[PDB]
Amino acid sequence: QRREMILQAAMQIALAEGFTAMTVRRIATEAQTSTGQVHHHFSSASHLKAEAFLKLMEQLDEIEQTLQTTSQFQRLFILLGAENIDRLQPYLRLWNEAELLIEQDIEIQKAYNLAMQSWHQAIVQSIECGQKEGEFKNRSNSTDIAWRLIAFVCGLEGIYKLGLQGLAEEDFKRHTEAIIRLELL
């Protein structure tokens, strides 16, 4: 299909050069079609940016369910983006890129909340699976654990941006580890 071929075409340029490099001329050249055909398929320049982002976070989610995880503790560590595995930094960079564009773009803002809700229910599925298999304790509401876990990993990342003195950036995995043990172990 012509459309999905241009949908893909927006993904690798998004996954590599970023959002600002995703113009109709850039993706029509990379898809090797007329620019005219790109305006035909997609309703707007922003609509394509959001739909390339949403379908790419779904891609991130899809491979994220095909990892060799020893324990459910490991799977949840990856699910929080705290492991920073080798072939996932592109997708995580685009997620962080979309975090700043939600103020200026209404399409990107829509898809960001969409990916955030899917990220939450993916962690909710992680808490309930571990509890049903004996790996995790049942201390509190699974939904509430997931929101506090998301708030902590997003909050720890923000405190790292400030260049604070005394804090170590090598302790991100350690602090995330300790909070998970207190919540589920």
Place this chain on the structure above:
Amino acid sequence: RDQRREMILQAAMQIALAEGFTAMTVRRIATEAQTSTGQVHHHFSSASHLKAEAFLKLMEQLDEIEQTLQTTSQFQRLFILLGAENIDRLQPYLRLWNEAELLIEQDIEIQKAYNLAMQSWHQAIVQSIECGQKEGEFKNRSNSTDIAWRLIAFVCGLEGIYKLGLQGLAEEDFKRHTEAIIRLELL
């Protein structure tokens, strides 16, 4: 030292709490301090320099207000120290803290004062944690420094998720989620 320099500072803090940083022009501050524009420039290198200096004083003053709040348990003091208690008197100081967070990228003066206030915030939470441990109220699971950084990172992250307008996010659980994290860490 200079009573004239302190007079302009008190005017800048007065404008900062009421309206915010954008209304803190030295034209408006000089009028508030009943002086000339040239006098403000004599004591402060810029409106941004005077903005960061007045911000540090307001956060030092907010600190002093939280400590005059008659509290009993140290676990209760940790609540107002994290800003989750929702106090009417303390709303303008917390409003300016969030306002200063958005100016750290475009203002190097305010950015310096923001990290200083955050380091003083981490100091007080460390102090309150170690005080509750000496009284046997809190447990010694981990060091006070790590728990204080984790507590600051949680409240900052929880308020950020609320800004997203996410569906099913409950703003009124800020008190509940903060009460939880404190219990897992120290209680």
